[PDB]
């Protein structure tokens, strides 16, 4: 009675020689404080579906707090990564 | 170097299933809780067909264990009725023996990844099978 | 207790098409190949067959029961353990008239092979012909002629077979040939083979000190799907290390790459990433050499590589000298007639501007014409070629009925 599912498609894609390496990297940083600052999102776990398509899940116990926090992150993921070099856009869903 | 050659072409043709048959009667017994098929060895053997592959069928239908004796008998952890023994014999033979272009009961049986195959001696078709 | 080691030696299985060289390849490995399936999935999307084996021998039995593929002996009657002597694995070939570009790839992963050939079919015939001559130009010297299907023949044919592979072995690269007559169906036969393979196929000294030098022939994505991002692993560039070798955390380049084309001329950078991986079958390693087909897990994005994107590409040291070239020049030799067809008629020149599929590696691609001297031309390659050392083998083959055709082959003048 407190769980609510908070997903949504996402694009990433790289030339660095690192690929999945700064893909780590972004996600590892832009997924930072999120689950301290905006607090109680029971979890976060962002994961991949096919070839460049991924999603991220962000359960938490109020769905306002939800989409409150699941944005802040994509919106570090294009942002920071964009600043290695990791071409990540939106695929909103 | 035909001396060479001939040499092991005459060693792979002793190495044939013969050349070119009623099918012998399958003598069954009890003792106990066993169903023996004395012969099941020499049956299989004159269809071509591998002794696991009989029993794995013929267990499978009956529902029941059973290996090999060490003189090709077999011996079913169960004691059946002599005649419900052959009707799923021959329902064996009709599925992985017989061809089903002339039904000679003069073939072999293929393998591949996923698809067996009846391969009549006779008329030169391929029936394929379920594997199992 | 035998040791789990990579292959040493990479012998293909050629022919021509129905004649068994599938079938025997699992006579032998006792692994069924899908060079002859539909798959939707990772990997292959090439019709080319892939089986490993390893080779023992109990030097308490005779030839040629003698010589075994697993650690047991009972298959002589014995049990003193068998001594482990390589490890080899075949290439499956395609042997269908059209998908001869294909083979010609496979081909250059060959290290030596098996010309297999029915019985019950008049010799030689199309592919079998082709296929062999194709050998003989790619650069291959050790050759088994496996006569097989004769548990459908008569010894007095068998025979009368025997003498024409003969004959028609005259004068060619491969004079003096062996014949193993086999049954692939049956597995009979096989030992002879395995001695055959053991005496006339032996692995080639590996010059260690050469540049590092992969072909490839495939890519993939393994990450399942749903895999967490802390899981994920790199695209996997498979293929054959064809000379040198390489090692894990090592820094390797693919080539042409990327393409890139904006603003203006379109051209090809290099793809940089380090090995993140080695594999051969099921057994991981920490350094690849010839012989086998290998994976190099490597650090790039998926994307790149998961959809066998980077065949025809070689892999190289980051650091290296490796001309992708559009144009080049080839001094190439026209062959007979266009072995391979049915209305046996003679290679038309080379006439400029005219286009033609060059064969490279496992790579293939079309140009068109631009020099033709008496023995040299030059190409204008719609993708770039990488040239790893100067003058490596090419094969030349020309549309000629809607089909491709072999018609010669020449040396990439870098
Ligand atoms: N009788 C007989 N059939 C064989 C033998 N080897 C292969 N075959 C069969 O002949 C066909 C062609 O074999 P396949 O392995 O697919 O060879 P491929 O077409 O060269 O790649 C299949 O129907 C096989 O089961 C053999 O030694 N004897
Ligand atoms: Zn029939």
Redesign the interface.
């Given at each position: 009675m407190r769980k609510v599912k908070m997903s949504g498609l996402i694009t990433v894609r790289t030339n660095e020689p690192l690929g999945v390496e700064k893909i780590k990297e972004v996600i590892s940083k832009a997924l930072e404080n999120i689950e301290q600052d905006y607090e109680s999102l029971l979890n976060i776990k962002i994961y991949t579906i096919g070839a460049p398509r991924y999603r991220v899940d962000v359960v938490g116990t109020n769905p306002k707090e939800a989409s409150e926090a699941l944005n802040q992150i994509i919106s570090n993921l294009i942002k920071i990564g964009k600043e290695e070099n990791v071409d990540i856009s939106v695929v909103k869903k | 170097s035909?001396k060479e050659?001939?040499e092991?072409?005459?060693?792979?043709?002793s190495?044939?299933?013969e050349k070119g048959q009623s099918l012998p009667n399958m003598i069954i017994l009890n003792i106990g809780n066993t169903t023996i098929i004395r012969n099941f060895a020499e049956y299989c053997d004159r269809i071509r067909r591998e002794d696991k592959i009989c029993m794995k069928y013929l267990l499978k239908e009956l529902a029941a264990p059973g290996n090999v004796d060490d003189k090709g008998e077999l011996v079913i952890q169960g004691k059946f009725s002599s005649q419900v023994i052959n009707t799923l014999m021959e329902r064996f033979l009709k599925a992985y023996v017989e061809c089903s272009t002339c039904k000679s009961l003069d073939t072999?049986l293929?393998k591949?990844?996923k698809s067996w195959y009846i391969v009549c001696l006779a008329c030169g078709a391929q029936t394929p099978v379920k594997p199992l | 207790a035998w040791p789990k080691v990579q292959p040493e030696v990479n012998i293909g299985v050629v022919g021509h098409v129905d004649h068994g060289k599938t079938?025997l390849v699992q006579a032998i490995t006792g692994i069924?190949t899908?060079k002859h399936?539909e798959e939707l999935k990772r990997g292959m999307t090439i019709k080319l067959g892939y089986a490993e084996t390893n080779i023992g021998v109990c030097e308490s039995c005779k030839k040629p029961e003698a010589y075994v593929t697993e650690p047991s002996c009972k298959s002589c009657g014995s049990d003193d353990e068998p001594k482990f002597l390589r490890r080899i694995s075949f290439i499956d070939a395609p042997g269908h008239e059209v998908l001869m570009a294909t083979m010609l790839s496979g081909a250059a992963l060959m290290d030596g092979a098996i010309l297999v050939v029915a019985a019950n079919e008049p010799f030689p015939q199309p592919q079998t012909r082709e296929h062999f001559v194709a050998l003989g130009i790619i650069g291959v010297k050790n050759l088994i002629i496996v006569q097989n299907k004769?548990?459908v023949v008569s010894?007095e044919e068998?025979?009368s077979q025997?003498?024409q592979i003969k004959q028609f072995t005259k004068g060619t690269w491969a004079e003096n040939v062996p014949?193993?007559?086999?049954?692939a169906?049956?597995k009979?036969?096989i030992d002879?083979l395995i001695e055959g393979i053991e005496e006339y196929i032996k692995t080639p000294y590996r010059d260690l000190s050469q540049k590092p030098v992969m072909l490839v022939i495939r890519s993939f994505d393994v990450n399942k799907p749903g895999t967490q991002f802390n899981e994920l692993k790199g695209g996997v560039i498979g293929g054959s290390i064809i000379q040198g070798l390489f090692k894990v955390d090592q820094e390797i380049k693919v080539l042409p790459g990327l393409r890139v084309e904006k603003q203006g001329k379109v051209s090809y950078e290099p793809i940089f990433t380090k090995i993140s991986s080695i594999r051969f079958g099921d057994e991981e390693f920490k350094e690849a050499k010839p012989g086998g087909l290998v994976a190099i897990g490597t650090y790039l994005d998926p994307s790149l590589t998961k959809a066998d994107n980077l065949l025809g590409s070689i892999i190289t040291l980051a650091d290296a000298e490796v001309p992708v070239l559009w144009n080049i020049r080839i001094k190439y030799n026209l062959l007979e007639r266009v072995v391979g067809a049915k209305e046996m008629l003679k290679v038309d020149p080379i006439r400029a501007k005219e286009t033609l599929m060059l064969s490279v590696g496992s790579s293939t691609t079309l140009g068109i014409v631009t020099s033709v001297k008496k023995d040299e031309i030059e190409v204008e390659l719609r993708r770039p070629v990488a040239v790893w050392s100067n003058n490596i083998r090419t094969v030349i083959s020309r549309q000629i009925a809607g089909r491709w055709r072999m018609i010669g082959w020449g040396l990439v003048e870098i």
């Open positions: - | 035909e050659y001939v092991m072409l005459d060693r792979l043709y190495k044939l299933p072999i293929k591949e990844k | 079938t069924w899908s399936s004769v548990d010894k068998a025979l025997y003498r014949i193993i007559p086999v049954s169906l049956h009979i036969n002879s």
